[PDB]
Design a protein around this ligand. Sequence first.
Ligand SMILES: N[C@@H](CCC(=O)O)C(=O)O
Ligand SMILES: N[C@@H](CCC(=O)O)C(=O)O
Ligand SMILES: N[C@@H](CCC(=O)O)C(=O)O
Ligand SMILES: N[C@@H](CCC(=O)O)C(=O)O
Ligand SMILES: [Cl-]
Ligand SMILES: [Zn+2]
Ligand SMILES: [Zn+2]
Ligand SMILES: [Zn+2]
Ligand SMILES: [Zn+2]
Ligand SMILES: [Zn+2]
Ligand SMILES: [Zn+2]
Ligand SMILES: [Zn+2]
Ligand SMILES: [Zn+2]
Ligand SMILES: [Zn+2]
Ligand SMILES: [Zn+2]
Ligand SMILES: [Zn+2]
Ligand SMILES: [Zn+2]
Lengths: 253, 253, 254, 254
Amino acid sequence: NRSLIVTTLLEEPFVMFRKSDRTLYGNDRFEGYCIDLLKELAHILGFSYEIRLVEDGKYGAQDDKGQWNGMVKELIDHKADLAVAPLTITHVREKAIDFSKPFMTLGVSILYRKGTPIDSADDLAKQTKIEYGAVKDGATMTFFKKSKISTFEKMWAFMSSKPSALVKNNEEGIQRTLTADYALLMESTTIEYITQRNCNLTQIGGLIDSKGYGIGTPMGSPYRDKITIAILQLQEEDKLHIMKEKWWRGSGC
Amino acid sequence: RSLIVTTLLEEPFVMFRKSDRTLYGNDRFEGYCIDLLKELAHILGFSYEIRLVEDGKYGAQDDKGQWNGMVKELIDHKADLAVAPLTITHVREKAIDFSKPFMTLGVSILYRKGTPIDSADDLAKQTKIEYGAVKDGATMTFFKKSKISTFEKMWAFMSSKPSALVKNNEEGIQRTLTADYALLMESTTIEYITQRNCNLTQIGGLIDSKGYGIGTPMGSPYRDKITIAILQLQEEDKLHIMKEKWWRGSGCP
Amino acid sequence: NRSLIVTTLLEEPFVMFRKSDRTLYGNDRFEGYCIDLLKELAHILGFSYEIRLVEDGKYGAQDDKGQWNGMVKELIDHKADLAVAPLTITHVREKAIDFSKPFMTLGVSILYRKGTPIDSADDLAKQTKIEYGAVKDGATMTFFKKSKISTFEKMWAFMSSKPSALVKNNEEGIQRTLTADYALLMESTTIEYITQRNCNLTQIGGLIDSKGYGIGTPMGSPYRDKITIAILQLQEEDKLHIMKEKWWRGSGCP
Amino acid sequence: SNRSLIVTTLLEEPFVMFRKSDRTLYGNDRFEGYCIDLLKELAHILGFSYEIRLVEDGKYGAQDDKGQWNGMVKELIDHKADLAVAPLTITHVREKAIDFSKPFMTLGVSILYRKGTPIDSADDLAKQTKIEYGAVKDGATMTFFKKSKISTFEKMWAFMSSKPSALVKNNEEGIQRTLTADYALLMESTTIEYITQRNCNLTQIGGLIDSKGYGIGTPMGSPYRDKITIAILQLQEEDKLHIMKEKWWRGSGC
Ligand SMILES: N[C@@H](CCC(=O)O)C(=O)O
Ligand SMILES: N[C@@H](CCC(=O)O)C(=O)O
Ligand SMILES: N[C@@H](CCC(=O)O)C(=O)O
Ligand SMILES: N[C@@H](CCC(=O)O)C(=O)O
Ligand SMILES: [Cl-]
Ligand SMILES: [Zn+2]
Ligand SMILES: [Zn+2]
Ligand SMILES: [Zn+2]
Ligand SMILES: [Zn+2]
Ligand SMILES: [Zn+2]
Ligand SMILES: [Zn+2]
Ligand SMILES: [Zn+2]
Ligand SMILES: [Zn+2]
Ligand SMILES: [Zn+2]
Ligand SMILES: [Zn+2]
Ligand SMILES: [Zn+2]
Ligand SMILES: [Zn+2]
């Protein structure tokens, strides 16, 4: 019964440190949507596991020499059996790792202060006053870096140049939108979570694309297909809807 | 000690049966759901009376948040069961309960044969051919809430053109026959209509995948009883029979 | 070389030789529900394949030694990668091979001529005038042979006795039901098919049990879960209920 | 009710057993077995916490002269427990004092006895008188014999009810009696299957005398019985009770 190593990262409301009056340790430290999903997978498949936060705190992207970092790298180097996180399924990633079928669908959109004229990526790309960016070495950054749409190449040209447009993680980005004249390009279900809690913030425009989160495994993993089946089972039983309603609030706004 | 069953007229699910000597009460009806409902009362032993829903609608929420149609009857405890082709949706689950599904369906397109229109994207790209859905049903709500770019575009259209949203299927079917109109309609009804009308066809495949379930007010102890009874009928492979029975039918050269 | 080998057998309307004037070869020889299912599975999963009829024409059962025959044996001996057929998933066969999730439901029931008093397996079990049996070395036979239920043991003891009550295949059992005083223990979806083509036969009673057909693989095969995922996709696209209507449709009886 | 549900059960191999350890265990962690795994699946599917309590009198449950119950059935009647999770037999008389889930296991009464003897059926035992036989006191097998009107089983009850010693306190006493004296135990078939795979000098005599099932027990009106039935059907559909049975019915030899 060897324990599977699960790689992940802190990201509200998917993976969080649970509140306690003493120092917690091991798996007991964590709670959130992806923790509940992991618990379901472990139950259905019958495995035990050890959660390990990815050291560099990244989701994963390729450098110019094609080397990966983040959770994707942990899977490639067979340091982890599974990545259980809001890990975006993308063509470039499917070349290096395997994914389950998606457990949640989302798309790229914009987080910004309420009360302004702007209503689309178009408006940001036109102007230089309002700064904008995305999480460094995640799928949204890669989306822009790869885009052939004029508006998005324009936006990448910006993000790529401005030293601090690319933020370390979502939290740093959300604080930037509250602290400065800055809009964050961010995945839509996280926006949904934030705007039900911070009434100062809103989504700008709609979804720029449509994609999904999946459980990541190393290529050739003998678990990936069973995990797909389990996700399809949870879906059929309405369990992912229940899990989302559990973690998305709360009250406000 | 009898249950009030809310429904509406819809072939081949609920129909006024043909006879000479005027019929009263439950005797007024035949159809797939009528048979289904008989099989459920046998298994669970209850008495009931069918009541057609006044506004003729399935159910959707207004801006204010009030529901109408059968969904509203259950909310208001004006009915015990909704026995009809009532689509299980995550939105409705917030307001009422459903049994496990008794039939699968997905949104798809009903249009005349022999055109070049091949998918929803084809309808969304143009404006000569109009298109719509049944007002205040699940398919309308699907387009209204959609975050997918093509379906948002379609929703802008339907939502704007007068009379693109039809009062019921029959009126939508008639608009498909007499005008340049495509109806966004559930696949099991499309199946029923296209083997009776050889000049109509399903365009594309399923846009989504859902089922029909028996509706109850939230918390009702019958929901689970009805699920057990539906499972029983599935083990006795009796529902697939009931379907073949009401779906006939001589075909199209 | 890496094409998958598919074992199957002829069984209307699942797998049949296509009618043509010009001689057909290879996979093009075949048509039917399981052939359409196979094409869909191959599209989804991305494989090419070669269909081969199982030599002994049997589905599969175990002799007294413990040795299997039919399609089950082809899988056990790693002679085929998949069994694509109306192959009944049973707990007994699960000990030797693996199955996908089911793509169709069925149960054992009774095929007999119309116009008699018989209405249940118990009516058959009480009386010796009317002969009855099942396809030899299939799941229905095995169900009776393994049953611990008194009535089915009784029925097994009867079938087991009659020299020719255990028929070679469905087509033979169908003919014996037509020409002798004989009832065939047969899977319900086949009865459905037959009773709509032959208005002098009918199903007697309901289902005795409830089971499914699944694709068989050798035990431990990675294709097993892949095939399940592909079946779930076809179910989401509601393609199997349609495939079924395509192959079972026809003019009924008065 | 309460927050954690109270589960009544009793020690019966291989359904519920004390797990092995080199320290004193406590609470739910004391237990292992088929019915413990089932309970774990139910608790996960329904989302409840629970506390297992062994039934004080160690009985399954029967009615005395008045209708006074004992054993697990009694714990449910009196609402001392929310569920009974055990190889609890579904019978008419119990169905009138408590509710049961759909069955999670099918079984029948049969005979456990030493190998070798010419004994071959209940009839054989009923005639003769040297070989004693009995059943577990205040269990469903005892009650079946008491209430029977079949000649052979009436004779058998006549014996068992006359002897002070025929009826044993539990399966374990009875099994030991079978190994200790010329004695046959009337016992449920899946327990016989477990025992005969471990005790190679014991065997089943004859077949199953009836056919019934085990179900999860709840007090009448429990808000949990329907959800539990749906859970068991769900587990069955995934082959999980087959897997669970294979896990606990192991042994070696025979
Ligand atoms: N979910 C993203 C990180 C967030 C983002 O890029 O917006 C990923 O998998 O890379
Ligand atoms: N069956 C749908 C009505 C028809 C439709 O929306 O297409 C419902 O339950 O709302
Ligand atoms: N489908 C059965 C053969 C037909 C029957 O046994 O009735 C099997 O897989 O063995
Ligand atoms: N399973 C039985 C106990 C054992 C027996 O009576 O043989 C019961 O629930 O009473
Ligand atoms: Cl321990
Ligand atoms: Zn679960
Ligand atoms: Zn490795
Ligand atoms: Zn589904
Ligand atoms: Zn009410
Ligand atoms: Zn839902
Ligand atoms: Zn395709
Ligand atoms: Zn092999
Ligand atoms: Zn099994
Ligand atoms: Zn159909
Ligand atoms: Zn489980
Ligand atoms: Zn009480
Ligand atoms: Zn089943």
